[PDB]
């Protein structure tokens, strides 16, 4: 229904940035009402399109420095700040954003995607479990579940 659009746009946004190695931190709200974490980033309330997401995580802008929050099928806010986790199972040499993505699924029923600004590999974080180097179909099958 309304689930085939907004999922199409997310996949096209993610495949865009992963070919270009642009740091990407994308959280989607499900059951855990993350209202306290939305008020830390620039309010948007904008309808989701692949082009708006790519513009949000551009190298140096006011909005890039953080996460994009996804309540309903809208972009709640951008540049939001999440908790880090300090779990030992984070391979060091990365993190910063990876640490804050597994850190927001440790507290919530949400789902967080990341594109590593060092390699371009698409990650995913559900309930404190991180899966590195996801494929394109892998992300779609994964999202179709949501």
Partner 1 sequence: GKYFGTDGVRGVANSELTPELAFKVGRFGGYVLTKDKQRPKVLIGRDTRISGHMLEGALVAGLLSIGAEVMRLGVISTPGVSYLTKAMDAEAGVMISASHNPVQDNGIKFFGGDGFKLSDEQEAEIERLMDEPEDKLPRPVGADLGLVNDYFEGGQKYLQFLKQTADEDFTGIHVALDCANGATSSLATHLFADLDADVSTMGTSPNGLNINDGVGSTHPEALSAFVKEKNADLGLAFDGDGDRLIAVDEKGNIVDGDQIMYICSKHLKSEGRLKDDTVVSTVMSNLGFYKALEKEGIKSVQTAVGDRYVVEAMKKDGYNVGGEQSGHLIFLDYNTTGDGLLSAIMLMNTLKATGKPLSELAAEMQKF
Q: Which residues bind partner 1 (CB under 8 A)?
A: 8, 19-22, 36, 39-40, 58-61, 65, 81, 117-120
Question: CB 12 → a second copy: shortest distance, Å?
Answer: 10
Question: CB 145 → partner 1: shortest distance, Å?
Answer: 21
Backbone conformation region of residue 103, classed left if phi is above 0, alpha if psi is from -120 to 50, else beta: alpha
Show the beta-strand stretches assigned E in the chain: 24-28, 42-47, 68-70, 74-78, 111-115, 122-126, 129-134
Decide if 23 contacts 101 (C-beta within 8 A): no
Q: Which residues of the shown chain bind a second copy in the complex (CB under 8 A)?
A: 42-47, 49-52, 54-56, 58, 61-64, 75, 78-79
Decide if 50 contacts 13 (C-beta within 8 A): yes
Residue 8 binds which entry of partner 1, a second copy, none, with Cβ cut-offs from 5 to 8 Å by kind?
partner 1
Decide if 33 contacts 76 (C-beta within 8 A): no
Q: Compare residues 61 and 127 and give the one whose CB is closer to a second copy.
A: 61
Q: Compare residues 58 and 129 and give the one whose CB is closer to partner 1.
A: 58
Question: CB 43 → partner 1: shortest distance, Å?
Answer: 11
Residue 117 binds which entry of partner 1, a second copy, none, with Cβ cut-offs from 5 to 8 Å by kind?
partner 1
3-class SS of residue 28: strand
Decide if 68 contacts 82 (C-beta within 8 A): no
Report the C-alpha gap between 137 and 32 in whole angstroms. Answer: 27
Residue 81 binds which entry of a second copy, partner 1, none, with Cβ cut-offs from 5 to 8 Å by kind?
partner 1
Residue 120 binds which entry of a second copy, partner 1, none, with Cβ cut-offs from 5 to 8 Å by kind?
partner 1
């Amino acid at each position: 229904e309304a689930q085939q659009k907004t999922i199409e746009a997310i996949t096209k946004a993610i495949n865009y940035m992963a070919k270009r190695r642009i740091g990407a931190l994308l959280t989607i709200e499900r059951d855990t009402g993350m209202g306290d974490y939305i008020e830390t980033g620039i309010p948007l309330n904008a309808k989701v399109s692949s082009e708006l997401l790519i513009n949000i995580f551009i190298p140096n802008t006011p909005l890039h420095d953080g996460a994009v929050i996804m309540k309903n099928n809208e972009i709640a806010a951008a540049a939001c700040y999440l908790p880090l986790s300090e779990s030992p199972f984070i391979s060091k040499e990365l993190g910063t954003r990876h640490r804050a993505a597994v850190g927001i699924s440790e507290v919530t029923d949400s789902l967080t995607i990341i594109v590593s600004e060092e390699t371009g590999g698409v990650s995913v974080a559900k309930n404190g479990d991180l899966h590195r180097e996801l494929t394109e179909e892998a992300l779609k099958e994964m999202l179709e579940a949501e």
